Amino acid sequence: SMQFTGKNVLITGASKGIGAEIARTLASMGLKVWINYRSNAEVADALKNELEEKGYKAAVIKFDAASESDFVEAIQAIVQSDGGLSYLVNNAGVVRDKLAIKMKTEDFHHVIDNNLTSAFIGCREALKVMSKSRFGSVVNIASIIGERGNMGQTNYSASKGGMIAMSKSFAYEGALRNIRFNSVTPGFIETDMNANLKDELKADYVKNIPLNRLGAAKEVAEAVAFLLSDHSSYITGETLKVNGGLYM
Amino acid sequence: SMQFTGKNVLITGASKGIGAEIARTLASMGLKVWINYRSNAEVADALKNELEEKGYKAAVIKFDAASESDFVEAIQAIVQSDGGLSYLVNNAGVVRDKLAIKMKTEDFHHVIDNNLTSAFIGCREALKVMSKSRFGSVVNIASIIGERGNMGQTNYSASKGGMIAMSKSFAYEGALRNIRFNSVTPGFIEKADYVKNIPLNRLGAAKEVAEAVAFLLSDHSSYITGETLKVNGGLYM
Amino acid sequence: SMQFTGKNVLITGASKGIGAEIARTLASMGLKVWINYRSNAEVADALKNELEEKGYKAAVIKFDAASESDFVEAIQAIVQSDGGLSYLVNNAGVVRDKLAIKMKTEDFHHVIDNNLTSAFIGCREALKVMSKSRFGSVVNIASIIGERGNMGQTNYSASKGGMIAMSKSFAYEGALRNIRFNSVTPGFIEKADYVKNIPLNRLGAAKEVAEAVAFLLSDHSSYITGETLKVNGGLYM
Amino acid sequence: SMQFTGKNVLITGASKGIGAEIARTLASMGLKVWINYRSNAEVADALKNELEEKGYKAAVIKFDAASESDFVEAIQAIVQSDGGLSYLVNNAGVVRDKLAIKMKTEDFHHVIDNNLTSAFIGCREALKVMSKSRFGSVVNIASIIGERGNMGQTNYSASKGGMIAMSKSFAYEGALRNIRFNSVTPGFIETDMNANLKDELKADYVKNIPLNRLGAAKEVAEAVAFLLSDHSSYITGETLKVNGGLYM
Amino acid sequence: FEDIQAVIAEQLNVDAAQVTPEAEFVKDLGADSLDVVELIMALEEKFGIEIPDEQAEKIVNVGDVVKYIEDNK
Amino acid sequence: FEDIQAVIAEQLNVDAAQVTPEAEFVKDLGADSLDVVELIMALEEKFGIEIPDEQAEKIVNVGDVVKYIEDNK
Ligand SMILES: NC(=O)c1ccc[n+]([C@@H]2O[C@H](COP(=O)([O-])OP(=O)(O)OC[C@H]3O[C@@H](n4cnc5c(N)ncnc54)[C@H](OP(=O)(O)O)[C@@H]3O)[C@@H](O)[C@H]2O)c1
Ligand SMILES: NC(=O)c1ccc[n+]([C@@H]2O[C@H](COP(=O)([O-])OP(=O)(O)OC[C@H]3O[C@@H](n4cnc5c(N)ncnc54)[C@H](OP(=O)(O)O)[C@@H]3O)[C@@H](O)[C@H]2O)c1
Ligand SMILES: NC(=O)c1ccc[n+]([C@@H]2O[C@H](COP(=O)([O-])OP(=O)(O)OC[C@H]3O[C@@H](n4cnc5c(N)ncnc54)[C@H](OP(=O)(O)O)[C@@H]3O)[C@@H](O)[C@H]2O)c1
Ligand SMILES: NC(=O)c1ccc[n+]([C@@H]2O[C@H](COP(=O)([O-])OP(=O)(O)OC[C@H]3O[C@@H](n4cnc5c(N)ncnc54)[C@H](OP(=O)(O)O)[C@@H]3O)[C@@H](O)[C@H]2O)c1
DSSP, X not given: OOOOSOOEEEETTOSSTHHXXXXXXXXXXXXXXXXXXXXXXXXXXXXXXXHHHTTOOEEEEEOOTTOHHHHHHHHHXXXXXXXXXXXXEEOOOOOOOOOGGGOOHHHHHXXXXXXXXXXXXHHHHHHHHHHTTTOEEXXXXXXXXXXXXXXXXXXXXXXXXXXXHHHHHHHHHTTTTTEEEEEEEEOOBSSSSSSSSOHHHHHHHHTTOTTXXXXXXXXXXXXXXXXXXXXXXXXXXXXXEESTTSOO | OOOOSOOEEEETTOSSHHHHHHHHHHHHTTOEEEEEESSOHHHHHHHHHHXXXXXXXXXXXXXXXXOHHHHHHHHHHXXXXXXXXXXXXXXXOOOOOOOGGGOOHHHHHHHHHHHTHHHHHHHHHHHHHHXXXXXXXXXXXXXXXXXXXXXXXXXXXXXXXXXXXXXXXXXXXXXXXXXXXXXXXXXXXXXXSGGGGOTTSSOBOHHHHHHHHHHHHSGGGTTOOSOEEEESTTSOO | OOOOSOOEEEETTOSSHXXXXXXXXXXXXXXXXXXXXXXXXHHHHHHHHHHHHTTOOEEEEEOOTTOHHHHHHHHHHXXXXXXXXXXXXXXXXXXXXXXXXXXXXHXXXXXXXXXXXXXXXXXXXXXXXXXXXXXXXXXXXXXXXXXXXXXXXXXXHHHHHXXXXXXHHHHHHHHXXXXXXXXEEEOSBOXXXXXXXXXXXXXXXXXXXXXXXXXXXXXXXXXXXXXXXXXXXXXXX | OOOOSOOEEEETTOSSTHHHHHHXXXXXXXXXXXXXXXXXXXXXXXXXXXXXXXXXXXXXXXXXXXXXHHHHHHHHHHHHHHSSOOEEEEOOOOOOOOOGGGOOHHHHHHHIIIIIIHHHHHHHHHHHHHHTTTOEEEEEEOOHHHHHOOTTOHHHHHHHHHHHHHHHHHHHHTTXXXXXXXXXXXXXXXXXXXXXXXXXXXXXXXXXXTTOSOBOHHXXXXXXXXXXXXXXXXXXXXXXXXXXXXXX | OHHHHHHHHHHTTOOGGXXXXXXXXXXXXXOXXXXXXXXXXXXXXXXXXXOOHHHHTTOOBXXXXXXXXXXXX | OHXXXXXXHHHTTOOGGGOXXXXXXXXXXXXXXXXXXXXXXXXXGGTXXXXXXXXXXXXXXXXXXXXXXXXXX
């Protein structure tokens, strides 16, 4: 485990993937996790039922993280039920890869709006509900390619890079009320988002990763847990690389 | 002066300030500068006159860098007039500072759509027109804020951090074509108590930014792509 | 607490300050801490007693971390006693600040040989003993100075910037062996006017550094190698 | 060309390689270049004679850059002849690659002493002879692998990384007298230092370099020239990547 | 088809014999991708108007290129 | 030699038939480098004392390993 002074956590896009495994990990450390989903609740409720049967406190909550009014009401309901929100994790993310010349301002905005704007609302509402309680930790799931860039991901990289720079400024804004903002920039994780991909391009990656494997969603998750826990109490505006050596 | 293989350049938001001073600089090195403006012609043509008056080549052009059709069509007009396009500087930027809790999603979008999306259409048309000639250089004007962040600038930090990471990805995409992509991050350019954080003990002058940009478009930086060049007097190392 | 696959750990320069507080922390999580000291036993055994008194395991050991034979032989002694070695923290450091023009080559070397070369023998013996077990974690304690520099610390900035880049290279070398290498860069740890540059408006406490180190040695960071983890209250983002 | 307010420049290890091409470039921009060599003057004098025959002002000067007394006297003689030194370039560098377990504290120190200490003396003596004249630019040739690390180069990376952090501090120290320190971190340049290397490992690199070629020593050189020239007058404590996209 | 043969063969440094109708652009004629996007765009410089992504996705070998053109004529 | 065969074959997951005297460690038996450094060091765990770098440089295939050992015995 790891100590937490807080009690509950909101994890946008937590139904599947790294978001799921963040919820399992924070739950099994005795936090109350609010699994967010946007569309089909059959996977989110299944996760919630997996976690309660293990004896952890869990819940599900429906909103589009890119929708301001839908996001703000969501947290308000979390505060109303629990009397405050201690930990936010902006995990919600989409990917749409295209060579720039075939890419369209819809495809740029689709990623910006879902990957960047959602995180802004999160961090913002995170200041609001946490300022008076003089405590808080937020973690924005970014990506290696916000630090490095990548071919065919001019929209995804634009959004992850904004998220890392934006998180730095929030950390300035919330630092005096002991509200810390950090980012996690994972390498290539064995999840839903990149599962469908050419083996010619996948073993291509493995041979560039010094640790010689794709990372586990549980491994991004426990790094997010450290950054939210109290062990990280002097760490703010940092970016934690979880990429097995793929970029240093 | 500095060696340029290319002939012309497009400078978004160049009617005043740092954009004007990149146009002034880049013209004095022999390029035909395509100044654009969004609103006031009067001052934009003043600049075109000031440059043409020193015996440089210079042209104005009117489009909103956030508007896809206006800017795509612009570049198409410049290609059709001058034969092609060699250099582009995504200089167009806005600022609307606020603490986060006082900031509405409109206040975020106004900066993202106008600092980052504009840089996107720019770079994307750069790739489109410079590929057949296999040659080009693009420079995106960011800020120290895209590297450090800043209190009251979560919307701007977002758009400049975007622009930096987006630029690196374009740099991957156009290398297949000897089309280089790089960013410049200026610090404080010309209260005055903020000078104590700068090691050079002064506010950098816009010409100091224009020459950095000129170096990144020039042939000297012909092996530099994907880089971010800090012009900040040492404020952030 | 935190999950550790390994049993023991060696902490260079651990008799006092941040080193003592890494020993105290890492022991309270169940590891056998091998404190070392270079000179004063008295205070080093005080710490060994304080830990053993709370029912933790703990051992002192005497060697100069700059002295190749002393430290190679140390680790050989710890292997021979405890069967092997799992974790190492290169914490040994010195400081001798001066303006550059007042600084003699001896004043440079005293810091390089004692902050960076020590980290070298450490990491190098880490690779030597942890390979057969295919498991380990090494943490080098750097500083915000190795990232930002600082006036009057060209010798220290050199040794901490070295240690960071050296650590990344060791991380490449031992990945072939599931041996992770990472750095921690603490900011100001506990005049007081320097607190105005820290966003958290306070000097970090050494336990806040020890737990960062513990996280980098623990199994949670099992996909983190080559990273640099800033523990600086936001002084440098 | 490019404007320079200064007149002469000292370039440690300038006889061959990138150091040579720095000297050609700064010379052909009308600077007086002091080509340093450590051992055999047949290549340094040949370079000096190449440059004067072109009509540029050049010279040669013998010292081991890692030798403090030998370095300090060298600059003193440069000041005595020319009445001051405007521009220093710490180019002098050695490489010795070994897996860490086969590496020896001699091999660590050989690189540290030659790559790092030499640069310290340079920057230091650079403050001295430039402080009273309220002008100066210094450029330390580092390397990509001071930023990234690399397998088998724990000694080289240690030294390049120190050089980049050390240059930052000098830039603090000399900033008020308008003395600027910058580093150039090149990628893989087609010179003497890496010429002898397996084609299996060389084409390995090329396919990782987005610009799809090894850089030219002339290309590191013109980037050093920009950083010394006046066009860079607001740039200090920066690190300029000249690696064709190999690292971003 | 003959002028389609010469276009893709100029477009990526291969002679017309390479262009058998069902030689693939990537497994056979040896091309990255921008190569195929810029070829398709180059093929829309024949004014086959803006043939859709939903029909270009299925382009892999030169014969599909003869389709989709003579479709969108 | 027989025990030399079994050592390198354990040392890098290959059976003894692979070990023909002039099979190379890298072109034949399939090994990176630490693999060969750690093998040589493992072979000095036979107490062939610290055979020099200047004689190990020339080790490429298993027969040289039979040399340099029986030299430094
Ligand atoms: N996996 C990697 O290799 C990698 C590496 C870097 C970091 N990450 C980051 O990790 C996060 C996602 O995890 P994953 O890679 O495992 O992807 P995934 O399996 O696709 O999970 C992403 C989840 O986010 C949800 N989501 C998206 N937009 C949302 C919104 N507006 N409101 C609420 N939920 C929303 C999803 O949407 P649906 O309704 O569409 O299911 C889905 O449940 C992202 O931030 C991604 O960019 C990925
Ligand atoms: N100077 C600094 O301290 C600092 C810091 C970092 C770098 N820079 C960057 O420098 C750039 C401009 O320099 P500046 O500070 O001198 O700013 P400025 O004084 O506001 O000049 C910016 C220019 O961009 C124009 N512009 C804005 N949006 C545009 C659009 N969509 N299309 C076309 N033109 C547009 C301006 O607006 P109007 O037509 O409304 O006048 C003006 O001509 C920006 O990208 C800024 O982010 C500034
Ligand atoms: N606290 C800060 O503000 C700050 C900033 C960044 C991080 N750190 C880092 O923290 C580490 C130590 O923390 P500290 O600041 O609390 O320093 P400290 O108070 O000086 O403790 C440093 C320890 O290292 C020992 N030591 C030095 N050289 C040694 C050697 N060759 N072999 C063995 N032990 C040796 C010390 O010397 P003695 O035996 O002489 O006592 C002492 O036990 C250093 O690497 C420092 O660079 C400090
Ligand atoms: N080439 C690359 O791929 C690459 C990439 C990163 C940057 N660089 C850096 O570029 C510099 C060298 O250029 P190069 O790669 O072209 O190497 P090179 O051809 O080997 O040239 C290096 C020169 O430095 C001299 N030198 C070394 N130590 C010296 C000392 N103490 N005093 C005076 N001169 C000394 C040499 O010594 P001799 O007497 O032995 O000739 C030689 O003339 C170094 O800082 C290197 O680390 C190299």
